[PDB]
């Protein structure tokens, strides 16, 4: 019913759908597998963000085509989406949750340090590097991201003779937008550890909205008894209603659940294993 642009076709051979829009492709030059995200005709900001960022737990953009549709050429993540590992009460072993979560915190810490809020962190935006359970993860889908309160800061420089009270009231919470990412991470971690969502409409009277605002997650003890008290304590500190009290990425990384030298060693191992193919000889 349509064709690929001549500019894309020149550099790549298009193949099978990976996610439905993400297709598999081969770079003609290298014969290496790539991932091509097709967006129907925001994408300009997403490219701008992707190009500037450089972290091993954040997806890299390889190329871009602005045609009848937008084509974003990205690194292929063979393991697919983390969603596929947690769907329909499927659960990850605590050790796997830790390894993936640690990387997610490093990735999100990097974003916040670089003035970027993702705003749409979910298992569908967390990609696995291989079909192995001990693998590298990367955050994707920067379409809803924000670049960090200059409008309020400038307003405060003047005399508030004519300034509205709601604006002065907003000074209290201003600059805590990044806390939304820490909430999302808390929800992801809950799902990964238990196989079930903390807030849902399944077998409950209370509205999904009321559950979230009260911060009263559904706690099923039979499920959680299999999970450590440390892992649950970290979830608890991220699923905090007050964004000013909620755990930051630094506080989450300093948590006892993350003070695991074995998990840290396994991640560094996976890094060197990935980076061995690109490593140039160095001055000793
Ligand atoms: C399944 C769905 C999306 C995918 C994928 C496999 N691999 C990869 N690399 C970038 N996005 N993406
Ligand atoms: Cl075609």
Author numbering: 209 to 228, 233 to 253, 269 to 375, 377 to 512
Quote from the publication:
Checkpoint kinase 2 (CHK2) is a serine/threonine kinase crucial in the activation of signal transduction pathways involved in the cellular response to DNA damage caused by external agents. In response to double strand DNA breaks, CHK2 is activated through initial phosphorylation on Thr68 by the DNA damage sensor ataxia-telangiectasia mutated (ATM) and subsequent trans-autophosphorylation on Thr383 and Thr387 and cis-autophosphorylation on Ser516. In addition, we present the protein-ligand crystal structures of nine fragment hits, all of which bind to the hinge in the CHK2 ATP-binding site.
The binding of compound 11, which is the top-ranking hit in both the AlphaScreen™ kinase and thermal shift assays, is complicated as it can adopt different tautomers. Unfortunately, the structural data do not allow discrimination between these possibilities and it may even be the case that a mixture of tautomers is present in the crystal. In addition to the interactions with the hinge region, compound 11 interacts via a mediating water molecule with the side-chain hydroxyl of Thr367, located at the start of the activation loop just before the DFG motif. Furthermore, the interaction with the side chain of Thr367 observed with compounds 11 and 14 (water-mediated) and compound 12 (direct) is also found in a series of potent benzimidazole-based CHK2 inhibitors, such as 2-(4-((1-benzylpiperidin-4-yl)methoxy)phenyl)-1H-benzo[d]imidazole-5-carboxamide (5).
